[PDB]
Design a protein around this nucleic acid. Structure first.
Lengths: 175, 20
RNA sequence: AAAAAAAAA
């Protein structure tokens, strides 16, 4: 197991840029930026395959949320089956995040609860929109994270923490 | 980095407790 | 107010 998904890429990020970025973690087997079949438009993500699993782990541990062409990358172990992303089991939503909190800070704090598959502070032109997500490997980790962190002050601003809800599910419950 | 304070403990910083 | 993601070989 030595394949990383590298997402949230700027459309103009190339394979070469990714090699330059990831190469210091150790020798690379191959790198593929995924593209639309005919127009070749980047799909906003890539696979980076290391020769050594320890090297892939180092890169994930060390280079996550680093900026390439002005946008922080989001690295995961490759998991092409989207069923867990779809089910949201273990996935949590955080709101009223002070704008001083970035991806790395959110990751460092929440990883105390358990191993994180993926997390993200959402950003636009003005920076953090003040909300984000953290998807834990286990649902027990998510539950502890919610129980502990909901209603807490994070850098002086009170957060909501709760199970992630998809747009359809949320518009259902709000009516 | 992120500082965690608890409103139901008068806003006491509990950042170290949470991490362990 | 705020509710992601991934189309390889």
């Amino acid at each position: 197991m030595a394949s990383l998904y590298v997402g949230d890429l700027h459309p103009d990020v190339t394979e070469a840029m990714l090699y330059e970025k990831f190469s210091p973690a150790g020798p690379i087997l191959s790198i593929r930026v995924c593209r639309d079949m005919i127009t070749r438009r980047s799909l906003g993500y890539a696979y980076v395959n290391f020769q050594q699993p320890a090297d892939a782990e180092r890169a994930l541990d060390t280079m996550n949320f680093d900026v390439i062409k002005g946008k922080p990358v989001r690295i995961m172990w490759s998991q092409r089956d989207p069923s867990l992303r779809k089910s949201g089991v273990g996935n949590i939503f955080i709101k009223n995040l002070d704008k001083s909190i970035d991806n790395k800070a959110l990751y460092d704090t929440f990883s105390a609860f358990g191993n994180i598959l993926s997390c993200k502070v959402v950003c636009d032109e003005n920076g953090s929109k003040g909300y984000g997500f953290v998807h834990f490997e286990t649902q027990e980790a998510a539950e502890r994270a919610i129980e502990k962190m909901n209603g807490m002050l994070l850098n002086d601003r009170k957060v909501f923490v709760g199970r992630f809800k998809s747009r359809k599910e949320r518009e259902a419950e709000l009516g | 980095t992120i500082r965690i304070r608890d409103p139901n403990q008068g806003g006491k910083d509990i950042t170290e407790e949470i991490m362990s």
